[PDB]
Amino acid sequence: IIITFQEQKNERACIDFAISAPQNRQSFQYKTWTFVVSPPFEYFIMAMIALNTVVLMMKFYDAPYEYELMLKCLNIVFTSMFSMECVLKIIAFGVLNYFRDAWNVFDFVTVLGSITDILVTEIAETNNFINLSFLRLFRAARLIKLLRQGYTIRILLWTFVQSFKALPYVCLLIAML
């Protein structure tokens, strides 16, 4: 099936078709922009991503309850820092400049999810709905930010996923089966 697969030169055509294909310095805006574009800031964010994943891993069953309290405090600290990072981005860049990156939207959504999770877990039992705990996905989903830094693996995933997006009817045939 691999050897004989119909196509329904090309490199040059794709290259020739793809051939078609920052913020200013005024005030404290520029100071915040300089801080958030400083490579130390981005590296610090990466490091705290790593530490947050470590804290997410540190959970285990039947903890002394001085361990769970420490984990909750660390989660509060991490989500507070991430909200602060989102605030400094939304100030240093424009609001339109921020919500038009397709990654800053994701970071903002995960920050709001984490904050809502923190707020709910304190009085969660009073909701009495099966969807009380689904807000805990955002802490885990914060892990994705390293997939950006993993260059070849991000390229590989994006290529294969956009390939899957161009075949919506084979999946419909399997669903029909």
Ligand SMILES: CC(C)CCC[C@@H](C)[C@H]1CC[C@H]2[C@@H]3CC=C4C[C@@H](OC(=O)CCC(=O)O)CC[C@]4(C)[C@H]3CC[C@]12C
């Ligand atoms: C690439 C690595 C360096 C990054 C991740 C490091 C840690 C976040 C991971 C490494 C292995 C994990 C540990 C694997 C097994 C232990 C012991 C385990 O202790 C028990 O189960 C005792 C309970 C009982 O015996 O009844 C609790 C989780 C814990 C601390 C885990 C805590 C988090 C750890 C240290």
